[PDB]
Write a protein that binds this ligand. Structure first.
Ligand SMILES: N[C@@H](Cc1ccc(O)cc1)C(=O)O
Ligand SMILES: N[C@@H](Cc1ccc(O)cc1)C(=O)O
Ligand SMILES: [K+]
Ligand SMILES: [K+]
Ligand SMILES: [K+]
Ligand SMILES: [K+]
Lengths: 329, 329
């Protein structure tokens, strides 16, 4: 209530790939899994963040101890997306917006830990492990590890090479069993599995989501009803096409796991509303062309405005506007 | 007593190159120069260390505030010449041996500051400047800067790229006006002159010695009379050749600045002893072949045993043997 097998299924459902199944099952047989997710405090979170937030939700339902890392320094090291004062402001926008998302999807916040990188990444023992790690890692391996993650520019900065080793050490200093992120990470993840043990630390389990296409190709978490509508009307959803369909993906990765069902809103003329209890059923009806793109979008629009409603409320304070504007000028 | 002009001459004599003459003279017009020298606590110091020690001696005679940096972390980052426990032991061998050298040449120790890198290089603000610097420096520039200094290996380690930026930041954290080292450094020095100002810190004066050939091509600071003799008898000193002559170089860079003269020990049959008050005079007599290699070596041998005598005494304790043996097993 839940058994280790129900835990495993909740944690790993919808992932593209699990590294470390063997240790993962060892742990779940005995105790709760410790896991984190990291986000560099970079650009404004948009509705696509509900994809990783839905997995965090599943981790909590499974009994996991979840940490969220606001990787402020990593934002700095990644070709200075975020500068030195103006990192701290984005940290608070990210903390606020992320907690409102999770509240909105009904995730208990109370056993979720939020930490920011500069709470621990400038400490002496951490900094010492960074040098230690620098003495066994090649520029080659460090460069290879960040290829998909750090912005690739004409003359690579030294910070870009540091970035992967810090993300690996994060696993140890957050004292987790596992890290969850997108499949893009994978080379950083495999990097951490190889080098952490050279520092005498255990390799971690790694859980990778697919790169899920976006709803519009961005819809902002604070956008008005009216802009959600207009952004959706532009959204690309081809009749009968179940590949490369950001609308269907949003349903699969966010709306189904939320209530374990999805309601298509459809006029009586075409069958009336239908409630699907599994994604594969909706997909089949869409391929068969008995769910129209316009009905699919409207069913997502309704459900998405339900998600965004609280968030827009909370952030309808003048301090939060100050924060938003200050954070992104 | 000394004027700024006598100061400048003492500080810059025998150098191959001065960067920053303009600021250097500005400072000496008003106050004492702050300067350091750094040595990675790597292999056992040998008699060739008297070359940089003679310049440190001149810096003190000039009124300079001199810092000596025992760069323990740099020893680690430089392809792990020195490991983690066994760094600290070498630091104390280096501190002991260096102070005995300076005592031996009559340098007052009392206004010389000794510091080791790990006293300050793991601190938070230092570590933050390391990331800061990493965000403006390219792998390319950092790699280019260490080419002559860090051991170049088949697959370069990330630590090798860090090494130059740390040596630059050292200038700021030691609060010096200037750094003295060998000409090999030069690319690290020019690196520091370019990037320190991008962190909002001033560029420093840089003072570079030539790469002086060695006495035997090593003579250890603790070698017995008898091994100094045998090592010298092998030493290469071609008749009439004043280039590439480690014996003459040792005289020019160590023995002349020590007493401002040098005594050639020579039998009456060939003129008897002669006292030279300038290097250029000795050089001329050697080119002319009226100072023989065997007399040149014996004159150096005598003077060198005078240098090493105290040092061998001091280190004739069982703790110091313990230290030596422990440091180099
Ligand atoms: N690399 C992650 C962010 C992150 C940073 C540090 C970590 O420890 C973990 C994750 C991303 O691209 O989104
Ligand atoms: N690079 C110097 C050692 C050193 C290290 C750090 C410094 O800040 C200065 C000097 C050498 O090759 O001998
Ligand atoms: K981000
Ligand atoms: K990013
Ligand atoms: K050295
Ligand atoms: K060395």
């Amino acid at each position: 209530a839940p058994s280790p097998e129900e835990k495993l299924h909740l944690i790993t459902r919808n992932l593209q790939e699990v590294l470390g199944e063997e240790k993962l099952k060892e742990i779940l047989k005995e105790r709760e899994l410790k896991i984190y997710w990291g986000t560099a405090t970079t650009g404004k979170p948009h509705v696509a963040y509900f994809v990783p937030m839905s997995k965090i939700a599943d981790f909590l339902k499974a009994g996991c101890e979840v940490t969220i890392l606001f990787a402020d320094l990593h934002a700095y090291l990644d070709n200075m997306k975020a500068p030195w004062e103006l990192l701290e402001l984005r940290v608070s926008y990210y903390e606020n917006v992320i907690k409102a998302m999770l509240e909105s999807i009904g995730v208990p916040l109370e056993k979720l830990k939020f930490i920011k990188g500069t709470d621990y990444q400038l400490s002496k023992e951490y900094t010492l492990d960074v040098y230690r790690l620098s003495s066994v890692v090649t520029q080659h391996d460090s460069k290879k590890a960040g290829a998909e993650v750090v912005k690739q520019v004409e003359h690579p900065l030294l910070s870009g090479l540091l970035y992967p080793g810090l993300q690996a050490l994060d696993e140890e200093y957050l004292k987790v069993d596992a890290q969850f992120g997108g499949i893009d990470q994978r080379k950083i993840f495999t990097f951490a599995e190889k080098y952490l043990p050279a520092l005498g630390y255990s390799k971690r389990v790694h859980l990778m989501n697919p790169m899920v296409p976006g709803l519009t190709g961005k819809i902002d978490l604070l956008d008005r009803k009216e802009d959600v509508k207009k952004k959706l009307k532009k959204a690309f959803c081809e009749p009968g096409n179940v590949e490369n369909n950001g609308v269907l993906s949003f349903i699969k990765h966010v709306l189904f796991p939320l209530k374990s069902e999805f309601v298509i809103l459809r006029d009586e003329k075409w069958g009336g509303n239908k409630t699907y209890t599994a994604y594969v059923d909706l997909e089949k009806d869409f391929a068969a062309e008995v769910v129209h793109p316009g009905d699919l979008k409207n069913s997502v629009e309704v459900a998405l405005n339900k998600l965004l409603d609280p968030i827009r409320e909370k952030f309808n304070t003048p301090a939060l506007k100050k924060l938003a504007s200050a954070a992104y000028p």
